[PDB]
Amino acid sequence: FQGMPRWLIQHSPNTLTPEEKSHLAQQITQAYVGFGLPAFYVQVHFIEQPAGTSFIGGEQHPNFVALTIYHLARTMTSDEQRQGFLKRIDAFLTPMFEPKGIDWEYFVTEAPRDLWKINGLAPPAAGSEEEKVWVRENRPVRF
C-alpha cells in the first residue's frame, strides 16, 4: 500500500468512548503500518454529531458510526488487494461495533497522487531509500 490514508469518523453521542476512539484509531494505524507505511501518514479524526444533526432514513439515529476513508488513486488496483483491505479493516470494525448494536457504514474515495504533501514536502516513493529515512525518523525529511 502506498500514499495517504485519511479517515473521518462521524458518530452519535454516547456511542464511542474516548478509549474506544483511541483504540479504533490505533487499530487503523496498525493496519497501515503493517502495509509498510510510516505511521505518521495515518490520520484518523472523529466528529461527534449532536442529537438533532444526523439523519439516517430521515430519522435521528442514536447509535451509528459513518466512516469516510480517503486514499490516493491506483493504490489498491487488484481485486485481491481490495478484498484483502476490506477483510483487514472488517477484522477490527466488526468486533468493536457489533457487540454495541452500532449501525456503521464505510466507503473509500480516491484522490490524485501528485497533489498530496506533508509539511510542504511530497512524500517519497514506496520502497525507496528516502521512505526508509522517513519511517526511521517518523517525520517528513527534507533531502
* Residues 86-115 as x/- pattern, contact with a copy of itself by CB under 8 A: x---x--xx--xx----xxxxxxxxxx-xx
Residue among 42, 39, 41, 36 nearest 126 (CA): 36
Residue 26 contact among Cl ion, Na ion, a copy of itself, none, beta carbon within 5 to 8 Å by kind: a copy of itself
Residue with cell 526508509: 132
Bridge partners of 110, per DSSP, are 71
Does 132 contact Cl ion by CB under 5 A? Answer: no
Does 17 bind Na ion (CB under 5 A)? Our answer is: no
How many other C-beta atoms can be found within 10 angstroms of the C-beta atom of residue 112?
Answer: 9
Q: Do residues 109 and 69 make contact, with C-beta atoms less than 8 angstroms apart?
A: yes
Give least dist CB 56 to a copy of itself, A: 5
User: Of 9, 63, 116, which is closest to residue 126 (Cα–Cα)?
Assistant: 116
**Contacts with a copy of itself, residue ranges (CB under 8 A):** 4, 6, 10, 18, 21-22, 25-26, 28-30, 38-49, 52-60, 66, 68-70, 72, 77, 79, 82, 85-86, 90, 93-94, 97-98, 103-112, 114-120, 138, 140
